DNA sequence: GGGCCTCCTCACTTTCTTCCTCACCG
DNA sequence: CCGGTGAGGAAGAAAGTGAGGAGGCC
């Protein structure tokens, strides 16, 4: 089973709380409601899915093209085990506000209105305000408010961090042709990133670690933010002790396993040695992207 | 025994991750 | 010169979010 708080971070990660409101004749209101708490990802971390799904006894899980695999929890019995881990663990980021609108929508089917004209269109209301918010086939049908109160918690603890990391972390290492001479370059980086819309927390990790710094990234309208550390004390001293205690999941833990062998002969001065730089680029081949 | 629920196959957009370059300073 | 550091931006796919179909529960 995995640590209930490495779940937690690891779902404001990759989690995504769904309501489906559909168009049925064959329904007495004309609408079929869903609600789904959803997790895909690569394949090749099938098993933190699995395991996952073993810790809550609940959801399905099923394949979504070659490369991907998605597990799902949408009957309406097994929802409150949902629930129930995200009250006694709360998420958050920005992803906290779809839960409790989530949230809404369940006490809304648990007590029926969602079978009633009235009950759907609260729904229709809450799902305005969840991830993409209302189609356009259902903005003609209920032309009715356009907004949900902003998310302010800070950090919890380390195993929420390990949880958010096994999700968005970025465990790499640098390399490039130095320009005025025939040496190269070598930098070990460690980086976290998030839409801005999560400002303040990225902001927090530069308290909560002690280090590092945030970059404003964009292409065109899109702009997301990267949190980096590339300060090697830093690293050395402050992140691989955090993750060597709070235990990252998934491949992304194999991923930290070989940057720390990197991180070893860069400690010892072996990547401004020429064995040491082969050996680095052969660490470099299994890893990340390169897995 | 009619709605109603649940689970399947499946696909859209983008938010992440990954990778690359390089000027600067001490 | 040289290595460490931080700042920039490119590429694209692993994510996030959500689609229709339908068997069968109660
Ligand atoms: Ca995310
Ligand atoms: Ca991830
Ligand atoms: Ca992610
Ligand atoms: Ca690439």
Known sequence: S??????????????????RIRNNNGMRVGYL????????????????????????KVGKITNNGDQAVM???????????????????????????DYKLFKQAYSVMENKEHLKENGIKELVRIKAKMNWGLTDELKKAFPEIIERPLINKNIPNLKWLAGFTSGEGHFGVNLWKRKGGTHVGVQLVFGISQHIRDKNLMNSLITYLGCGYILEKNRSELSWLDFRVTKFSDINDKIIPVFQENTLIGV????????????????????????????????????????
Request: charged share 35%.
């Open 71 to 97: 597990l799902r929890v949408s009957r309406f019995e097994d929802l409150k085990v949902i629930i129930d881990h995200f009250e006694k663990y709360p998420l958050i980021t920005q992803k906290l506000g």
């Open 2 to 19: 995995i640590n209930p708080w490495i779940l937690t971070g690891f779902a404001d990660a990759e989690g995504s709380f769904i309501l």
């Open 252 to 291: 992304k833990l194999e991923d930290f396993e070989d940057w720390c062998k990197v991180a070893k002969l860069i400690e010892e001065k072996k990547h401004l040695t020429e064995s040491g730089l082969d050996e680095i680029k052969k660490i470099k081949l299994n890893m990340n992207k390169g897995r």
């Open 33 to 56: 409601t869903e609600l789904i708490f959803s997790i895909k990802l690569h394949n090749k971390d099938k098993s933190i899915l699995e395991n996952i799904q073993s810790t809550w």
